[PDB]
Symmetry: D2
């Protein structure tokens, strides 16, 4: 069923900001594990669904409840990393270039400048007390306004919050290169953020 | 698919400990809503499963993630209330009579007496800071030892924790009769707890 | 230390939308319990602070960790209900009258109309799967934009999210009058929401 | 106020199971940050306490609520890592030697063997979906029975759960050596677990 996506850059294309060593593990091992876990979880739930169809008991319901956590976690890991690679690019492919169009206008109007939005996001990233993510989002329910939200583990933004830029704050995203110095990673990553993709996501809603 | 279970007592059979007014609403309205929500949630997930089978995208994954919370919540509400009615009985049907067999032995060995186990459980119930449940459980992974655990909302015990007695701490479980005096409800309910059923659950594992 | 605030209306002043019976219990019992718990929690933490000052052990730290949950919960219950009464008013005191000034402008620009903002908030209230709150907020970090957020239990909005209108979704807020029909309560309460106060909160930031 | 504890082994004393490189960062950087954050958090709360003493407002309460998360997180990080080093030892100091006394008896009676308890704990560690910990505990409320519990982030065991062995599952605990292969780390660490200390903790309760 679900598979790893293809990359638009080889593993070392984001150096010196993110190492090829990190990207290789992050994609081939971490992302793949979420792919596998999500495939497995949805399979198990199909099976339990059929079991419940013939025997709709509290006992059968309990097992379904048990599996929904793995659907959430692995589904989240699958989708978050897909967002992540797609909002990263080498400088040679426009990584680090500022956003355009309606997204650029909204950023200036709401935050004053891109740098102010990046500062806010770095504060949110440093504030993740555990594993998690920060997302720059477009909120479709309050007039399409930008915000920045944190999630923990592989929780994600759904429904009316549209993700524009995802930034991974799990330690595996930086530890081999930056070790404990997560703030240096949060600072560096903007040099390869694909704001063209964020602008397209803002438009597509 | 899932339906409300039948009751072994008419709504007013647990008076003066739980009113007929409460039982009527709790069963016909609250439990039914969880039945409906669980049926609806599993349906939506079957649909999304088929959508993912043909198009395994991060976008399609996001929608599945979104629905798993309703599967957990409504599935939990369905199963918890099923446990609840089945561990309640009027005095005329042995409600309030102490447990028997291997459960009775474990209670005395671990807690000293039933009253001590009830005290602990009432402390756990009063400590639910929000809506939730206390469950007396048998833990299959540590040698079958008894414990008491709290859950919030419609979260439940799964896997190696076997529920023996479920006690509802949501305000709808008591408010019409006891209003804010939840401790009076926690005290009263033991008079109609079906420890015969708890003993059977302990044996069945 | 902290005490219950005074009310700007007698308990029955919000009828037929919220009963005097509910307001009496909600204020004299529920709010008072949070007042007491918050006072007690901060006292215990002062004591533990002094203990740690003389003996900064992991053991002493563990006890402080244990008490911070009661500070959060009771502190939240204290502050949320204070917000709540202050954003409610009888019709004779302007309850139900639409907001004014910069808040009114922001609502129309972001949501199209007050009714649309109320609809969104009612969706958020019905979506609280357990006990909790919805808050209409002003977000100071994204240019002062309005949003609506849910919290569970007595969790609250802090820091850059300024609460403008708080709506209690705990069952004790409605059960005596509406029982399970929470949607009827969410619909009715807007008739006595004090939008003058929300407008002042929006300005004061 | 709180400070880093002294180690009973130099950083490389747990090789080849945990590298000196990891221990150096884990102690000097990670643990120190929690020390600093806990000191800072308790200071801020003392200040807010005094502010509330003179002005017990919902506004002042909101700020205290805001700080309790940092007390929990950093307090937890401080205490968890203190537990951690104290339950690790080089083989030359008895690391890896089985527990003794009443703890050894309880393990055999409840789990059948130490290996079975270790297997269960490794399952719990691999099941932490994010950052967190597994703790082998003695539960004082159910007759002193052993169990294994998971926590997330720097959440900890408090009150009636006595921690006997703490095992860190944050990625920084293993990533430099094992990278994604967390199961290899969970397997290896038992070779340097200080079961003498766990046995003393079991006795001291
Ligand atoms: Fe990642
Ligand atoms: Fe219920
Ligand atoms: Fe309330
Ligand atoms: Fe650690």
């Amino acid at each position: 069923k679900v598979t790893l996506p293809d990359l638009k850059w080889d593993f070392g294309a984001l150096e010196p900001y993110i190492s090829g060593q990190i990207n290789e593990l992050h994609y081939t091992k971490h992302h793949q594990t979420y792919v596998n876990g999500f495939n497995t979880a949805v399979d198990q739930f199909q099976e339990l669904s059929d079991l419940l169809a013939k025997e709709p008991s509290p006992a059968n319901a309990r097992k379904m409840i048990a599996i929904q956590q793995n659907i959430k976690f692995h589904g989240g890991g699958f989708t978050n990393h897909c967002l992540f690679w797609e909002n990263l690019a080498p400088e040679s492919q426009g990584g680090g270039e500022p956003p355009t169009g309606a997204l650029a206008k909204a950023i200036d109007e709401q935050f004053g400048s891109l740098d102010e939005l990046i500062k806010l996001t770095n504060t949110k990233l440093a504030g993740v007390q555990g594993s998690g993510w920060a997302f720059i989002v477009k909120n479709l329910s309050n007039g399409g306004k930008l915000d920045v939200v944190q999630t923990y583990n592989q929780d994600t933004v759904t429904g009316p919050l549209v993700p524009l830029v995802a930034i991974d704050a799990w330690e595996h995203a930086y530890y081999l290169q930056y070790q404990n110095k997560k703030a240096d990673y949060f600072k560096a990553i903007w040099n390869v953020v694909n704001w063209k993709e964020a602008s397209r996501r803002f438009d597509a809603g």
